[PDB]
Amino acid sequence: MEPLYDKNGAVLFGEPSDTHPQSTLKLPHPRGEKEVIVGIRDLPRKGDCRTGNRLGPVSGLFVKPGPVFYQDYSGPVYHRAPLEQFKQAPMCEVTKRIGRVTGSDGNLYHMYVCTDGCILVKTAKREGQDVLKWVYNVLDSPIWVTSC
Numbered sequence: 167m168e169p170l171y172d173k174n175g176a177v178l179f180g181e182p183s184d185t186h187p188q189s190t191l192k193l194p195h196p197r198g199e200k201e202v203i204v205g206i207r208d209l210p211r212k213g214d215c216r217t218g219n220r221l222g223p224v225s226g227l228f229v230k231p232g233p234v235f236y237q238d239y240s241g242p243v244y245h246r247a248p249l250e251q252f253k254q255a256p257m258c259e260v261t262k263r264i265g266r267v268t269g270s271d272g273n274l275y276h277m278y279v280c281t282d283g284c285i286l287v288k289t290a291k292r293e294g295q296d297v298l299k300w301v302y303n304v305l306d307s308p309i310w311v312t313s314c
């Protein structure tokens with residue numbers, strides 16, 4: 167199973183791994199002043215990092231299936247997409263491009279929200295060429311997609 171990380175950046179089980187250098191998640195980075203849910207129409211911006219915004223503090227963008235988006239989050243999170251909980255699927259009609267996420271396989275993925283509310287990833291380059299949807303979330307925890 168892909169590990170979770172606490173807001174001090176320590177692995178809560180298993181062994182820790184680094185993010186792909188080209189991921190939109192840049193570590194180390196603070197987070198977890200507050201858990202702040204946001205709507206997809208109110209996804210945060212880069213310049214919210216220091217000030218926060220109207221809705222509260224901002225460490226970046228987090229997402230889990232539902233879809234549920236957060237601009238900050240205090241509990242355990244994934245730093246890489248837990249691919250054991252994804253399944254192969256055709257490209258969807260995408261509604262939003264949300265960042266570049268490291269897969270639990272070490273590869274870079276483009277991450278999208280689909281019209282059907284699914285979170286989908288597509289491999290960024292190389293032999294890979296894979297499209298997968300996030301279908302299970304047994305630890306009910308988001309991916310940290312981007313850090314501000």
Ligand SMILES: [Cl-]
Binds near residue numbers: 168248249251
């Ligand atoms: Cl997993």
